[PDB]
Amino acid sequence: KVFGRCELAAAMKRHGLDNYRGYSLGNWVCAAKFESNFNTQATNRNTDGSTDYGILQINSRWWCNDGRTPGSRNLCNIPCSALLSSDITASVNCAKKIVSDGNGMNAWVAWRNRCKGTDVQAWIRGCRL
Length: 129
Ligand SMILES: [Cl-]
Ligand code: NA
Fold this sequence. Notes:
Blueprint: H1 5-14, H2 25-36, E1 43-45, E2 51-53, E3 58-59, H3 89-99, H4 109-114
Helix pairs in contact: 1-2
Bound molecules: chloride ion and sodium ion (NA).
Sodium ion binds next to loops.
């Protein structure tokens, strides 16, 4: 599923992302836009053999199992495929774990390079929230 900007913001707000660990909603929408272009089915293979999955591009090296990332962990306890669903619940629940692990949203490379230090509130402006 390809989310609309406002549609996704309302979805994320409902799942408890707004201000989660101090990150305003706009930060999450910004990250999702640049990581996956709001596409739940986005996948991208990395040099190390791991793959990033879903709207928040969560990595198979640590977070989910895809059966093809040798010596990897499954800290979210889920198959990576579950991160590609039209329902973002699995991605949200797992992202909450990632952002709580000490490095905050810096774990998302696109957020650090394209959202951090910007007017991220602009991503939810005009939305009925
Ligand atoms: Cl933080
Ligand atoms: Na894994």
